[PDB]
Coordinates of C-alpha atoms and ligand atoms in Angstrom, one line a residue:
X17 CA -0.3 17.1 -12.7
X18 CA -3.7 18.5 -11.4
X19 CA -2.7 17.2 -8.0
X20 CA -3.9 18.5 -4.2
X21 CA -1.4 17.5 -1.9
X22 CA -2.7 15.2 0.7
X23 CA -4.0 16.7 4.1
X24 CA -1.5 15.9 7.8
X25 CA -3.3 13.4 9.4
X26 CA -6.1 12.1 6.4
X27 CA -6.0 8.7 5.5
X28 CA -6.6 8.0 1.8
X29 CA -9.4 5.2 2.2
X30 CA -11.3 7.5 4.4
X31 CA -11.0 10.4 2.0
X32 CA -11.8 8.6 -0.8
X33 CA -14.8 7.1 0.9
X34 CA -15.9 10.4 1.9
X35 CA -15.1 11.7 -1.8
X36 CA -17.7 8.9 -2.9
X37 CA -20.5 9.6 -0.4
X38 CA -20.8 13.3 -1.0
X39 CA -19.6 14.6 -4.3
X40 CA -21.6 11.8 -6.0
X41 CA -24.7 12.3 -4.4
X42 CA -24.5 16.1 -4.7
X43 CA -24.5 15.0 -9.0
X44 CA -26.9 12.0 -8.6
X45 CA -24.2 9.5 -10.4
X46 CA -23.0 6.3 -10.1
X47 CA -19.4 5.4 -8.9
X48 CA -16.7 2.9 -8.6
X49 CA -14.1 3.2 -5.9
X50 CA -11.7 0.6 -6.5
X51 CA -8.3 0.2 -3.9
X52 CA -5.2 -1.3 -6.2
X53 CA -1.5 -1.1 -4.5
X54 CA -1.9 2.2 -2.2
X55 CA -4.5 4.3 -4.9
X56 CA -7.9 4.9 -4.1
X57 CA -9.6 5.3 -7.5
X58 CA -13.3 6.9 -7.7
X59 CA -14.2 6.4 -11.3
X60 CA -17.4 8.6 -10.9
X61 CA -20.6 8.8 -13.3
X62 CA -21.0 7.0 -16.5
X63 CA -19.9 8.2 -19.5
X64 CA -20.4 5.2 -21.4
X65 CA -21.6 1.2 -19.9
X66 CA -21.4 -1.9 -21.2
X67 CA -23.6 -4.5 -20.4
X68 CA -22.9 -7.8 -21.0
X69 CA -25.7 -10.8 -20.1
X70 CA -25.9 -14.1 -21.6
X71 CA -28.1 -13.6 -24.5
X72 CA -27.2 -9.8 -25.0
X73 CA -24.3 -7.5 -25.3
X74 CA -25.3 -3.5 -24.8
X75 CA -23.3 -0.4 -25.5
X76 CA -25.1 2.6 -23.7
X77 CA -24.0 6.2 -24.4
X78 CA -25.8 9.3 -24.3
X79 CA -29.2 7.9 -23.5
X80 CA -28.7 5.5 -26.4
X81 CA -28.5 2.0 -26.0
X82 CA -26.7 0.0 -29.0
X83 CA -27.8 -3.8 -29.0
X84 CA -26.0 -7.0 -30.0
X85 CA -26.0 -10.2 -30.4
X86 CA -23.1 -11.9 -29.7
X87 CA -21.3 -16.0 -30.0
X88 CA -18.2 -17.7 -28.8
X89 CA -16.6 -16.4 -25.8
X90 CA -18.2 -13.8 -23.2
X91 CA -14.2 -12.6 -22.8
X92 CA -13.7 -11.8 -26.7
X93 CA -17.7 -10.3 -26.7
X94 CA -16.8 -7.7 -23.5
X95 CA -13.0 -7.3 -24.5
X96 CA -14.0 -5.8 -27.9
X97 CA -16.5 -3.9 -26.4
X98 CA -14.0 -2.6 -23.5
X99 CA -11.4 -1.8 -25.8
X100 CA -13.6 0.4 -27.9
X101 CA -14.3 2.6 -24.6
X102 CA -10.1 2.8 -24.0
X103 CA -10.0 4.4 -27.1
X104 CA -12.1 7.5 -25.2
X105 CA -10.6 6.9 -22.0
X106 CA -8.1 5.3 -20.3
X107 CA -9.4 3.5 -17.9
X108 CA -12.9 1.2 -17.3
X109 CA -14.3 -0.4 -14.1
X110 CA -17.2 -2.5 -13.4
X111 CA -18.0 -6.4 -12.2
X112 CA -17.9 -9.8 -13.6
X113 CA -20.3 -12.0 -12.5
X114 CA -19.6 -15.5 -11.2
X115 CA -21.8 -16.8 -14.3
X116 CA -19.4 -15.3 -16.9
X117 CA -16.9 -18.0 -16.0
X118 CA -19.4 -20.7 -17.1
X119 CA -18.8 -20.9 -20.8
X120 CA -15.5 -22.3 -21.0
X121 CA -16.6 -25.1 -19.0
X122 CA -20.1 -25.6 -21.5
X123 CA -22.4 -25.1 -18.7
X124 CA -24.0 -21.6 -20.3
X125 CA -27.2 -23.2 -21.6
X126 CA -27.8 -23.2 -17.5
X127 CA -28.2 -19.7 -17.9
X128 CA -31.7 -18.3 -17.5
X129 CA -32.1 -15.5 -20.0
X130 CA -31.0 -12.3 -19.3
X131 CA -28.7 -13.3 -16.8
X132 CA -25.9 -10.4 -16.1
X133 CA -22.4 -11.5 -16.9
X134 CA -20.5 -8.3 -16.5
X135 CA -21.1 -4.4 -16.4
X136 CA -18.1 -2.6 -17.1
X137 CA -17.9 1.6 -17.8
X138 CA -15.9 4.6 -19.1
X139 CA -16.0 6.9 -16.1
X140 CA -16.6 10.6 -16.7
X141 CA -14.5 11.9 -13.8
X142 CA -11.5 10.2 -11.7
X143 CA -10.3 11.1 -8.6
X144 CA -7.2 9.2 -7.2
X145 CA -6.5 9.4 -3.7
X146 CA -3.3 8.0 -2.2
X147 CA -1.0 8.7 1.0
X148 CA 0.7 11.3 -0.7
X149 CA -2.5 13.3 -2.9
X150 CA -5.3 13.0 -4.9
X151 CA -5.0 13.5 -8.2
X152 CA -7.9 14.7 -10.6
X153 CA -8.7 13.2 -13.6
X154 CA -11.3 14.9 -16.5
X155 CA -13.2 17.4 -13.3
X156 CA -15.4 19.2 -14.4
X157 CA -16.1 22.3 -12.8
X158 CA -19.1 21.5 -10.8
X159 CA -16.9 18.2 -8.9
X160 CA -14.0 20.5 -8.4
X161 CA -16.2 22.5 -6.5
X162 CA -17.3 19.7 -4.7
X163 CA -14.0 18.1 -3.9
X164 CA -12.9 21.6 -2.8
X165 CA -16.3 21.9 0.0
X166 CA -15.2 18.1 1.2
X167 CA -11.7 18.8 1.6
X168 CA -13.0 22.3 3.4
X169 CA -14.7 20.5 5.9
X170 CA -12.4 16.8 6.4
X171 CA -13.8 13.5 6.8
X172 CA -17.0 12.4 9.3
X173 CA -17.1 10.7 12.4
X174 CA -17.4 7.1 11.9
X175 CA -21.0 6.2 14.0
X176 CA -20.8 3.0 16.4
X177 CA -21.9 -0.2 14.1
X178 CA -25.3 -2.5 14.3
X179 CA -25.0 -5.7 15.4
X180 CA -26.2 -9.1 13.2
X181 CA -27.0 -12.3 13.6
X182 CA -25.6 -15.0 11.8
X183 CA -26.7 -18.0 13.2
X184 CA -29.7 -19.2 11.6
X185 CA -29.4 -21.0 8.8
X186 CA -32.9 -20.7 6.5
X187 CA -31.4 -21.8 3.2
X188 CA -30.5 -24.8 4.4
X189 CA -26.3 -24.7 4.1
X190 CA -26.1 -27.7 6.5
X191 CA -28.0 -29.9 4.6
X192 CA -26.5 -28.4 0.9
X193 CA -22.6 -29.8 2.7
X194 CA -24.1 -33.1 3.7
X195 CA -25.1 -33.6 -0.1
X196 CA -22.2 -32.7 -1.7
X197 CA -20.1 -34.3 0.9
X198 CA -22.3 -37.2 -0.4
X199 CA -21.6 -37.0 -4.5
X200 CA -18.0 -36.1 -3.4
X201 CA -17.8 -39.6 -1.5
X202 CA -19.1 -40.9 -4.5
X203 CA -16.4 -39.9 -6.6
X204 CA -18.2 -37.2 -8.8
X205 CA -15.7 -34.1 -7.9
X206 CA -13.0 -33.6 -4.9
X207 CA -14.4 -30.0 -3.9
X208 CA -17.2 -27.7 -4.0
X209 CA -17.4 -24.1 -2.6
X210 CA -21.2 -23.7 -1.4
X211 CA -22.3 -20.8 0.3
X212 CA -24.8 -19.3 1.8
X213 CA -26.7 -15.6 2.1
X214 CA -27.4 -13.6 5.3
X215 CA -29.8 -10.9 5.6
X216 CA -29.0 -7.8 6.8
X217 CA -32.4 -6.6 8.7
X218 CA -31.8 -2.7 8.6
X219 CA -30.6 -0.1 5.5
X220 CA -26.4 0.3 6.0
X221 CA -24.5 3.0 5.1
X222 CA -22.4 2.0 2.3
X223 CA -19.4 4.6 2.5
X224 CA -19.7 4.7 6.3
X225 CA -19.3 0.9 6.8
X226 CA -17.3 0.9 4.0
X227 CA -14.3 3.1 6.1
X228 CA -15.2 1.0 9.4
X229 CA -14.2 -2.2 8.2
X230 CA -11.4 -1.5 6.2
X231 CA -9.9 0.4 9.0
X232 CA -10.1 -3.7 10.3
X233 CA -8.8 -5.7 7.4
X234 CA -6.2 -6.1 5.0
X235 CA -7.2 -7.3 1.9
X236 CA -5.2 -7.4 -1.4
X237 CA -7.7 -4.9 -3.2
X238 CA -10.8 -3.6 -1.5
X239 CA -14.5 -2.0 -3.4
X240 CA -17.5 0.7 -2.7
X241 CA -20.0 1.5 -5.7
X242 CA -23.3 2.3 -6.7
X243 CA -23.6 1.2 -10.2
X244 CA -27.3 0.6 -12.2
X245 CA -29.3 -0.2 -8.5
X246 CA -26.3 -2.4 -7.1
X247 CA -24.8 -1.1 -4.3
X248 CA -21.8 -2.8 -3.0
X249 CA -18.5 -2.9 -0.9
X250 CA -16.1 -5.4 -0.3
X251 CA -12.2 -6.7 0.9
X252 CA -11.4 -9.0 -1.3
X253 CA -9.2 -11.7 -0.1
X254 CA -7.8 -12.8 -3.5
X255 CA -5.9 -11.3 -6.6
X256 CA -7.8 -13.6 -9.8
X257 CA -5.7 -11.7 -12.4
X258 CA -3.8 -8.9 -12.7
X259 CA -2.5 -7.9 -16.6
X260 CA 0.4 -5.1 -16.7
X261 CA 1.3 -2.7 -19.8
X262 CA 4.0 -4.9 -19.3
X263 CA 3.2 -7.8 -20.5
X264 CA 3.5 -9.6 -16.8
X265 CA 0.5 -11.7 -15.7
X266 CA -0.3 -12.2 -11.7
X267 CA -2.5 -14.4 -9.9
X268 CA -2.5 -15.3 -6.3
X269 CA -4.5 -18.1 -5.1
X270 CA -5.8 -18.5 -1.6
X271 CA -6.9 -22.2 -0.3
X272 CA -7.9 -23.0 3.8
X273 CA -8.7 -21.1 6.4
X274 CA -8.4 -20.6 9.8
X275 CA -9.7 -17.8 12.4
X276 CA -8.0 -14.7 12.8
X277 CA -8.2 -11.7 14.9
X278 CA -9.0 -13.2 18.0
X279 CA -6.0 -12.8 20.5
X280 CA -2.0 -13.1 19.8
X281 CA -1.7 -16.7 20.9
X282 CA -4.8 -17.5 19.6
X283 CA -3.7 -16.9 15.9
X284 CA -0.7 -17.9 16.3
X285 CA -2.2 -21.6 17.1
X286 CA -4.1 -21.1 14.4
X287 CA -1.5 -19.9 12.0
X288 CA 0.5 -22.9 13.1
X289 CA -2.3 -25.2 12.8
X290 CA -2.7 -24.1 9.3
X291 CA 0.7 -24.0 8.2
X292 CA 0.7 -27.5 8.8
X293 CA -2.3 -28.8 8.2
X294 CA -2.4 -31.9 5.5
X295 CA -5.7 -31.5 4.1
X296 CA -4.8 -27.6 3.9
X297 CA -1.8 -28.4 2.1
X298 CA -3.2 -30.6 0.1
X299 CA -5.7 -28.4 -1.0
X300 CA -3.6 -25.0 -1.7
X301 CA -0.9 -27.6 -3.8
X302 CA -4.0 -28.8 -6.3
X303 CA -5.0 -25.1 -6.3
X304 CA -1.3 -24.0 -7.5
X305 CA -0.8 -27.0 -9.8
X306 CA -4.4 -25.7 -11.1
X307 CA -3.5 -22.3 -11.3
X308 CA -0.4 -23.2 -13.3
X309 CA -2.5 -25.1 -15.9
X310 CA -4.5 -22.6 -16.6
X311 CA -1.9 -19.9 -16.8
X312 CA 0.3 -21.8 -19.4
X313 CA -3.0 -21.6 -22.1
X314 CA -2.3 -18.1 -22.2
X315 CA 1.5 -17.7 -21.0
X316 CA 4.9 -17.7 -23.1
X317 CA 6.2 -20.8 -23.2
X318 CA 8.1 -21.4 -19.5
X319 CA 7.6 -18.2 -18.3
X320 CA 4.9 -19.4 -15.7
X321 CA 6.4 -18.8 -12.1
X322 CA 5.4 -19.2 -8.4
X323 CA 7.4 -16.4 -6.5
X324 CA 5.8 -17.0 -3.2
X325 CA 4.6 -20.3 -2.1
X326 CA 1.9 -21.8 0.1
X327 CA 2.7 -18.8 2.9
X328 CA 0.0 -17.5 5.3
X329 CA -2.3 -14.6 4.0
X330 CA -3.8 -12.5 6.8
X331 CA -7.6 -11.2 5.7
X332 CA -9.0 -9.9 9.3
X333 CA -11.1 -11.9 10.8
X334 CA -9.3 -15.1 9.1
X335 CA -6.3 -16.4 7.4
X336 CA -5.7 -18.5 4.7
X337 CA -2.8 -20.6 2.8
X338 CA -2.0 -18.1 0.0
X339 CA 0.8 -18.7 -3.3
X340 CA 1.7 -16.0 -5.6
X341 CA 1.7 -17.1 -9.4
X342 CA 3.5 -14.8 -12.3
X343 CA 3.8 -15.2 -15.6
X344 CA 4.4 -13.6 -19.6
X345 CA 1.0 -12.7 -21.5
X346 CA 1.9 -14.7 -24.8
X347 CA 2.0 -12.2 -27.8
X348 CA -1.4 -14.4 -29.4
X349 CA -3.1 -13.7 -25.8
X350 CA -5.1 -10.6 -24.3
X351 CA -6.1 -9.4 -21.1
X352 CA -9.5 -11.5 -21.5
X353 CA -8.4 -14.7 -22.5
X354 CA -5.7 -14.2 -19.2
X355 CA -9.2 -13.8 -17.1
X356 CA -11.1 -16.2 -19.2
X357 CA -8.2 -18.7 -18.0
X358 CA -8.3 -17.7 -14.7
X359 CA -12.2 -17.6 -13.8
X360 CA -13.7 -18.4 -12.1
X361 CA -11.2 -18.6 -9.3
X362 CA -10.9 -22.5 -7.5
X363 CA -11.8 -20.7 -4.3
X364 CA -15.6 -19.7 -6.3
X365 CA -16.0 -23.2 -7.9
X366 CA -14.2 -26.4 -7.1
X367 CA -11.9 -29.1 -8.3
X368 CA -12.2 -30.6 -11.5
X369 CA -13.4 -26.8 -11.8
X370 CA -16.3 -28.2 -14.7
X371 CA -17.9 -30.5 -12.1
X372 CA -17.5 -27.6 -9.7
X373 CA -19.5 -25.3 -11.4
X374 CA -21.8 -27.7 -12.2
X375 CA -22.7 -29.0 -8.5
X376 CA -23.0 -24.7 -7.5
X377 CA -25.8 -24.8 -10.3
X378 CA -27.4 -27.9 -8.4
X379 CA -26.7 -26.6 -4.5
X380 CA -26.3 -22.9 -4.6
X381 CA -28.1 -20.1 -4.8
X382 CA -27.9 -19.1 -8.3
X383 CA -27.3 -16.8 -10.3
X384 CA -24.7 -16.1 -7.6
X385 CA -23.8 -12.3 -9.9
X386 CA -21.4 -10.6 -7.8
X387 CA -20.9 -12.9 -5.6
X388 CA -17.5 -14.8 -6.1
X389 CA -17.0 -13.0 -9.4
X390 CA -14.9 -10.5 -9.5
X391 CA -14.8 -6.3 -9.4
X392 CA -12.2 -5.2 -12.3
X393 CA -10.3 -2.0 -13.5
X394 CA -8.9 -2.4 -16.9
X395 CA -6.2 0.4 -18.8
X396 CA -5.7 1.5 -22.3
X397 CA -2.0 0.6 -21.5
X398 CA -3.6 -3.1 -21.6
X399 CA -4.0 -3.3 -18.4
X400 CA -6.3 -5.5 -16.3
X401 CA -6.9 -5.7 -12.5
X402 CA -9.5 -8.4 -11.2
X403 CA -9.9 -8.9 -7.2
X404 CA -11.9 -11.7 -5.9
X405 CA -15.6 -11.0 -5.1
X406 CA -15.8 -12.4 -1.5
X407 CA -16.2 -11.0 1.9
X408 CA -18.5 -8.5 1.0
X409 CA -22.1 -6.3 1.0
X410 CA -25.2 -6.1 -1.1
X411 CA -27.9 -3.7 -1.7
X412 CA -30.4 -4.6 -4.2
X413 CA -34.2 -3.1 -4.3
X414 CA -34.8 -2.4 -1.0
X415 CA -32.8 -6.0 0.3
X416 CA -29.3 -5.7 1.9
X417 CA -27.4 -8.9 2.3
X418 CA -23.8 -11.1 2.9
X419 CA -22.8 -14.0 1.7
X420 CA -19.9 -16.2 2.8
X421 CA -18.7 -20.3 1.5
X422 CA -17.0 -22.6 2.6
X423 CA -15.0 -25.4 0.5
X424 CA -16.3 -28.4 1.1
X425 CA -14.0 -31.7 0.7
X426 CA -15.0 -35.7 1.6
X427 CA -14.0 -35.2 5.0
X428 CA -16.1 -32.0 5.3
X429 CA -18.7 -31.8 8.5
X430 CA -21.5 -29.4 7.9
X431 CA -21.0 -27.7 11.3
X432 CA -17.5 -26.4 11.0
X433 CA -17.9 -25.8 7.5
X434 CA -21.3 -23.3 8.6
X435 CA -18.6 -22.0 11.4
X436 CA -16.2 -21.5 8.7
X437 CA -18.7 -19.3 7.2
X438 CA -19.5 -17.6 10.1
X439 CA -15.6 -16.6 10.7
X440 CA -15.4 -14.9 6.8
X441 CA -18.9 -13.0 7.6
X442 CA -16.9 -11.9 10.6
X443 CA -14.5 -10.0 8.6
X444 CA -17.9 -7.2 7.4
X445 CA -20.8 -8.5 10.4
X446 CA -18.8 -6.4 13.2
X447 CA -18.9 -3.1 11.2
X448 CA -21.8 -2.1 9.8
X449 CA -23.2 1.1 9.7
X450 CA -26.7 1.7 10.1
X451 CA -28.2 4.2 7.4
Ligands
CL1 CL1 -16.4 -16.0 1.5

């Protein structure tokens, strides 16, 4: 239904890249291009938004803005809000900051006020683009006619990329690793992910770069938006949660990593190397046996499963140790207590995840917002999809940046975990697209 079948020779992320860049633009709106399982889905302008932040929760519709106050758990405040929008439409997209998964761990009253913890939105229009069409979804007139001029005139040339440098270190990461290499020695946590920012000197442009590097990664779901003065793009490594209509719960862990992308033999030394590496192992086994934990608070009894185990994951310009986890959404559970659970993910905090959390407060840049939170497409079938905020770009008042981590363990060395960082900046540094 209200389908255009899929031009010889176009390939979907391009199209819907292009689809994002122009039609938008030619309206002014916002957008939200998420990648889930071969669909492209541009969830363009805002019909309705929902802000939530950590003394607030906002309803905005039709220039008015409906305020509340709100208690308990961020996941019950947006999940009511969310599923009043489903009621209009049937699907909502947005971002979860990293900060929303502070609460269940106590750590909120960290929060400075007004600190975002999600934005998620009713779109007006949706356009889905996959290998074999685009479908539309609530087009008005004005963005048929604009879908029909792109597809009139097919997709740009991708201009040669600007070059970054990575190397210099001004917030300090080296010295942020040797402290909590310290407290770990200590015996106040076994892991921390810090990380660290890197400015991007010249305007990108986000659809362009957006097409160049994901013609040079594979991640499990991939981003482009523009939503209220964020602009963003990203390949996420890692599936946090995924909820189906259903009932089946995903989440797919990722621990270690080793380069990628830099030769046959290369990786395969690599791949090897990580396949067998204790400390890796060690490391993606707590994350499982974690991931299990938390999935059995909000699973049917025994239904908790992992159907792939501890096998490489290939992300571009690394690769880590990766376990798929599935599970039964209990009948007294939702879609937000099944992310609640699962955020934020053991690759964005630590282990004992409280005292994780706690030491990012102390040695990260925070609030971290998008950053290691996650970018998230819910249905009015009940379902939810949340990928994994990393390995991706930021445009915020006039400053463009990256930002890549490392998980730092007692045996840790703050030069290969800053080389570490510099290998997952690889995966977006390479391809960017000056504006
Ligand atoms: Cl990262």
């Amino acid at each position: 239904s209200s389908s255009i079948p899929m031009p010889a020779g176009v390939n979907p992320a391009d199209l819907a890249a292009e689809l994002a860049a122009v039609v938008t633009e030619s309206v002014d709106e916002d957008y939200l291009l998420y990648e889930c399982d071969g669909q492209w889905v541009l969830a363009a302008g805002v019909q309705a938004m929902v802000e939530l932040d950590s003394d607030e929760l906002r309803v905005i519709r039709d220039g008015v803005t409906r305020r509340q106050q709100w208690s308990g758990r961020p996941g019950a405040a947006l999940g009511e809000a969310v599923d009043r929008l489903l009621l209009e439409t049937d699907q909502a997209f947005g971002w979860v900051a990293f900060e929303f998964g502070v609460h269940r761990y106590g750590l909120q009253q960290r929060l400075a006020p007004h600190t975002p913890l999600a934005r998620v939105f009713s779109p007006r229009t949706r356009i889905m683009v996959s290998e074999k069409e685009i479908r539309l979804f609530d087009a008005g007139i004005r963005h048929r006619e604009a879908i029909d001029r792109l597809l009139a005139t097919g997709v740009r040339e991708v201009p040669q990329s600007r070059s970054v440098d990575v190397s210099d270190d001004p917030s300090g990461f080296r010295r942020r690793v040797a402290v909590a290499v310290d407290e770990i020695a200590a015996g106040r946590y076994h892991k921390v992910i810090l990380s660290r920012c890197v400015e991007v000197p010249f305007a990108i442009d986000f659809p362009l770069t957006y097409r160049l590097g994901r013609r040079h990664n594979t991640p499990v779901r991939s981003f482009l938006l523009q939503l209220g003065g964020i602009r963003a793009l990203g390949y996420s490594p890692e599936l946090v949660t995924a909820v189906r209509a259903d009932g089946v719960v995903i989440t797919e862990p990722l621990a270690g990593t080793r380069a990628l992308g830099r030769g046959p033999a290369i990786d395969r030394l690599a791949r090897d190397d990580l396949e067998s590496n204790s400390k890796e192992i060690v490391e993606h086994a707590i994350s499982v046996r974690s991931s299990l934990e938390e999935i059995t608070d909000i699973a049917e009894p025994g239904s908790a499963a992992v159907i792939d185990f501890m096998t490489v994951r290939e992300r571009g310009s690394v690769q880590h140790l990766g376990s798929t986890i599935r599970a039964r959404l209990d009948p007294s559970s939702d879609r937000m207590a099944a992310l609640e659970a699962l955020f934020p993910a053991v690759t964005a905090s630590g282990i004992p995840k409280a005292a994780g959390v706690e030491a990012i407060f102390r040695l990260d840049e925070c609030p971290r917002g998008l950053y290691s939170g996650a970018v998230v497409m819910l249905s009015a079938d009940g379902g939810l999809d949340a990928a994994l905020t990393l390995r991706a770009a930021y445009q915020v008042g006039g400053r463009t940046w990256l930002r890549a981590g490392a998980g730092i363990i007692e045996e840790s060395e703050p030069e290969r975990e800053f080389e570490e960082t510099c290998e997952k900046l690889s995966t977006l540094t390479p391809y960017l697209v000056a504006r």
